[PDB]
Amino acid sequence: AWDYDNNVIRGVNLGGWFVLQPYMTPSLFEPFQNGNDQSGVPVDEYHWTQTLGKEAALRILQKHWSTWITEQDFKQISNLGLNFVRIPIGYWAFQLLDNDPYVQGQVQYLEKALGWARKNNIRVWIDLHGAPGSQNGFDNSGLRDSYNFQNGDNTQVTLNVLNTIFKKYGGNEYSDVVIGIELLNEPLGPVLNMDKLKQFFLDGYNSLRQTGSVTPVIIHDAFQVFGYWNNFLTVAEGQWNVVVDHHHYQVFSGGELSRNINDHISVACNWGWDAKKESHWNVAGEWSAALTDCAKWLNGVNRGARYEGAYDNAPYIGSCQPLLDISQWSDEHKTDTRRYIEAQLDAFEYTGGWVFWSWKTENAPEWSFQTLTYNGLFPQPVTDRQFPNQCGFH
Structure with missing residues (x-):
């Protein structure tokens, strides 16, 4: 279905759909804030579903699954000249540990997506993005700050x-x-x-x-x-x-x-x-396209940005507030972004191709293929270059 020797992958991730990531869909987490206090905001999908309970979690997630990505997105992906999507999914879509708070139902939409891909000549990777006990302690695994994938029977459950x-x-x-x-x-x-x-x-x-x-x-x-x-x-x-x-x-x-x-x-x-x-x-x-870590909650819920010296003992480089809205970006930052995108595209097309993270976000422009394309910062067609041959590949 693909020739990895002769074809090049030009794709996007369908992130934030089947595994919740706070920075991608902050609207689902923000109702838990108390004024300016973020101490009560659940930090990951594990705790989000636990705090809400099974009934509320399923009601809210069913709405999310049915609207975040639809057939129209696959049409637009194909129309933009992309040939591929990567689909993150957590283990809990298939199997729950005893006492897991997660809800199921993702598989229905996974299977709809596979049909939409077929209809639009798009190829797919299915990616197991979250394993029981967590393989990395990142919030994108479902369970932050835990590293127990190799403990107990978690590796066997994953298999x-x-x-x-x-x-x-x-x-x-x-x-x-x-x-x-x-x-x-x-x-x-x-x-x-x-x-x-x-x-x-x-x-x-x-x-x-x-x-x-x-x-x-x-x-x-x-x-x-x-x-x-x-x-x-x-x-x-x-x-x-x-x-x-x-x-x-x-x-x-x-x-x-x-x-x-x-x-x-x-x-x-x-x-x-x-x-x-x-x-x-x-x-x-x-x-x-990100040159900063400014997107709200990119480093996790209740953690700041290194870019403005507010996390990980990093020095202050610049203020994030001006960079949160793509309409407030300087001409210099727009040009730097386009240069950086083109250099990466050339580097990745030099081998098997590339898969941008991600197709869409609520309000984080550096991480949204859609937003960057509509603002003229991601090449369209994807072969267009304003800064040709920055790397000198041969």
């Missing part, structure tokens, strides 16, 4: 959920639409046992293939250095149809945020050069 996904979506029924199943989003390598993580990846790979599936297996890089995965899941060992997913941002540390625009561009170009050297097919499964 059981993957087997369900493999049987439903890795078979003949969706072979024209599904071009990858991503085993686990962003396992936080530095805090995990990497030998056990590799065993988990291998078990997932073997399990899928054992069902008769030929669907590509997507492994996230676990924040390892370029080339780390070169000797894992290799054709020499009869392991085939494997893709590495690299995520690339320059906003989650003081050092990255303090770079001038030229140095941001140099780093982007180098992502391209280094990815070209790797031995697996690879795709930039997440990246954005």
Whole structure:
């Protein structure tokens, strides 16, 4: 359904749909604020659903699932020249732990989305974005500040959920639409046992293939250095149809945020050069236009921005307030943004392609493909360049 040698992925993530992220849909979290006090705002989907209870959570989420993304979005995605979407989903859509607060019902909409993709010639990865106990302690896993994916029976539960996904979506029924199943989003390598993580990846790979599936297996890089995965899941060992997913941002540390625009561009170009050297097919499964961490709650509920020296002991660089509204951006910031987008596009098209995070947000323009496109900052058509050949690839 895809030729990873000859085709290039040009896609968007459908983030915020099946896994709630406060910065993407702040309207769902803001009713819990008490004036200026954010101490009572639930920090993740786990606590959001727990605080609301099963009845209220399902009522509110059914409204969200039916409106956030619809068939019209898939039409617009196709119309903009995109050929691909990545769909994050949490384990709880398929299986609940005893005492889990989560509600189910996402699978109905996942299956509607697969049909809308078929109708609009869009291909798909299904991405297991959240594992029981959390694989990274990020709020985008469902459960912030916990790192228990490798504890107890949580790895086994994850494999059981993957087997369900493999049987439903890795078979003949969706072979024209599904071009990858991503085993686990962003396992936080530095805090995990990497030998056990590799065993988990291998078990997932073997399990899928054992069902008769030929669907590509997507492994996230676990924040390892370029080339780390070169000797894992290799054709020499009869392991085939494997893709590495690299995520690339320059906003989650003081050092990255303090770079001038030229140095941001140099780093982007180098992502391209280094990815070209790797031995697996690879795709930039997440990246954005952000040059700041200013979006409200990007770092989590009740945490500030490093950019204005309000988090992570970072120095003050600049005030966020002026950057929250794209109509208030300086001409210089608009130009820097366009340069940065084009450099990243060139770097990522140099290997397997790219998947922007994300299609839409309520009010965070740096993270919204729609907003950037409508404001002329994301190239349309996506091959247009105002700043041609910043990287000098050959």
